Amino acid sequence: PSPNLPPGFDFTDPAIYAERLPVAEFAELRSAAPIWWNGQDPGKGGGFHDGGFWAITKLNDVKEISRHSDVFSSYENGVIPRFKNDIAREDIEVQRFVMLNMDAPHHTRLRKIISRGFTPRAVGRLHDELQERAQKIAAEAAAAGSGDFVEQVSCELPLQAIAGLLGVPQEDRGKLFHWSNEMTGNEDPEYAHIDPKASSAELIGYAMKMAEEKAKNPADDIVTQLIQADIDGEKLSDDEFGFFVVMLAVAGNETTRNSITQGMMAFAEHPDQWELYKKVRPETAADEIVRWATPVTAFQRTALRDYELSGVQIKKGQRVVMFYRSANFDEEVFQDPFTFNILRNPNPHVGFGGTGAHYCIGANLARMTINLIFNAVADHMPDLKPISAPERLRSGWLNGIKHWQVDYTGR
Numbered sequence: 001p002s003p004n005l006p007p008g009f010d011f012t013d014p015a016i017y018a019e020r021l022p023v024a025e026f027a028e029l030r031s032a033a034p035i036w037w038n039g040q041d042p043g044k045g046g047g048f049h050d051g052g053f054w055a056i057t058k059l060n061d062v063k064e065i066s067r068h069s070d071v072f073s074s075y076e077n078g079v080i081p082r083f084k085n086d087i088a089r090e091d092i093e094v095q096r097f098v099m100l101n102m103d104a105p106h107h108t109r110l111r112k113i114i115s116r117g118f119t120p121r122a123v124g125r126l127h128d129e130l131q132e133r134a135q136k137i138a139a140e141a142a143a144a145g146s147g148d149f150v151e152q153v154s155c156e157l158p159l160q161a162i163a164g165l166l167g168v169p170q171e172d173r174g175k176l177f178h179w180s181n182e183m184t185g186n187e188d189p190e191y192a193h194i195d196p197k198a199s200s201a202e203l204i205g206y207a208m209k210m211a212e213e214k215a216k217n218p219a220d221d222i223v224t225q226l227i228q229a230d231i232d233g234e235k236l237s238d239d240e241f242g243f244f245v246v247m248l249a250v251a252g253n254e255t256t257r258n259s260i261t262q263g264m265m266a267f268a269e270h271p272d273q274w275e276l277y278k279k280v281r282p283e284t285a286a287d288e289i290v291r292w293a294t295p296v297t298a299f300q301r302t303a304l305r306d307y308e309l310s311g312v313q314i315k316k317g318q319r320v321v322m323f324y325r326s327a328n329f330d331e332e333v334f335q336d337p338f339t340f341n342i343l344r345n346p347n348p349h350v351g352f353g354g355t356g357a358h359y360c361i362g363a364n365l366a367r368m369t370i371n372l373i374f375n376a377v378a379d380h381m382p383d384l385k386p387i388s389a390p391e392r393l394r395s396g397w398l399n400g401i402k403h404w405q406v407d408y409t410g411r
């Protein structure tokens, strides 16, 4: 029995996500075809010209793929499942220079070096400054009475986390945030004029200059840790640091931002959860917010050899697309997945990916950011109420909210 889906439906179709999350369609696959070939017509494969991909909709299959990185490659085709249909293959293969799109052993060496910048000590050291900034952001927004929750609440704190992690001076954070914002969303008409190619080049150039400068004058931020050789002589080259910063500018910006926006959207839809949050302030809320928001709808892998996955024969060279948005509502794993429950514990969501070599290195920085900003929202605008429906982002792999008008005072 084939799944009940519109003909030619592509789960990476940006025109879908500009309007809605295809929640019913994902649930139909989970019930009727949990691993399903998503065919793609000629020239409509978002930069990939192989006829289609395997849609992966169950959490256990997402985890099995993520664990078997020896078979399911990030390097072969990158992990972004959709670009502009016209993108040149060389523009996809340039993504291989960031650690996200690397396989072992190159990924193994890089991740070990990058780990110096994401130790619990390195992240926890940002706590106090990010808490202060979260409080000031929410106070400034509440003083405005009403406005765009996305721009006035969700946007700044994730960017300040990247800036503080890297130790970017305050006078430079303006153009750093601009470059980071010009990296994503260019298939939405609102961002048709952004140039991620130019921005990534500017980010790399800025980052190399910063690596050269930071080598001359070490400090305590992670940049010194990254470019300092260890006992084995391992360190980031200047351009390697540049590719790290470009990855960070994307990895930590719109992901946490959209978790914040869609976390508040869930709170507006479930006022009992919001009342419970304001009273208890449970930090388990962050993980339920990420599960609910699933800012990365999907990442892909490519099979390096034949592999049988849950009774389905994946053939060498074929792409599998891990739909975290489907897996995070898998009825087999979650008790009442469609109930927003900020006390859910344990919460084995795959919003940060499936356990494995590429698991989000900034997951705890993200959770801290989310907890600090929602404590600040609760402190300064506890009676927030939405004014109109959110405006969704036209993207085939990012689940984004561009704008969301709310009344911070409630009256």
Ligand code: HEM
Binding pocket: 066, 099, 100, 101, 111, 161, 162, 165, 247, 248, 251, 252, 253, 255, 256, 259, 290, 294, 295, 296, 299, 350, 351, 352, 353, 354, 355, 356, 357, 358, 359, 360, 361, 362, 363, 365, 366
């Ligand atoms: C709610 C916020 C976030 C979400 C939902 C998220 C999601 C993800 C996902 C799905 C992956 C791929 C995992 C895999 O393929 O197995 C990933 C990797 C990564 N994330 Fe995040 N992320 C978030 C925040 C952040 C932040 C704040 C940072 C850093 C400041 C960060 C840095 C990274 C990096 C560097 C990688 C690549 C790791 C590797 O390939 O080894 N992320 N993230």
Ligand SMILES: CCCC(=O)c1cc2cc(-c3ccncc3)ccc2n1CCC1CCNCC1
Binding pocket: 090, 091, 092, 094, 196, 197, 198, 200, 201, 204
């Ligand atoms: C890496 C140094 C700058 C650069 O050069 C370059 C950046 C860049 C970015 C994209 C892109 C990013 C996100 N979304 C869509 C596109 C595409 C191409 C990019 N490039 C050129 C790389 C080519 C590699 C082979 N030689 C000629 C240059």
Ligand SMILES: CCCC(=O)c1cc2cc(-c3ccncc3)ccc2n1CCC1CCNCC1
Binding pocket: 080, 082, 083, 084, 094, 095, 097, 098, 100, 183, 184, 185, 186, 196, 200, 246, 247, 250, 251, 252, 255, 296
């Ligand atoms: C050298 C050019 C790098 C680049 O360009 C790029 C980096 C990057 C990082 C992520 C990411 C990493 C970890 N966690 C979440 C996200 C995702 C995409 C990334 N890219 C390509 C951006 C394209 C822009 C145009 N639309 C398709 C994506």
Ligand SMILES: [Cl-]
Binding pocket: 183, 184, 185, 186, 187, 395, 398
């Ligand atoms: Cl994008």
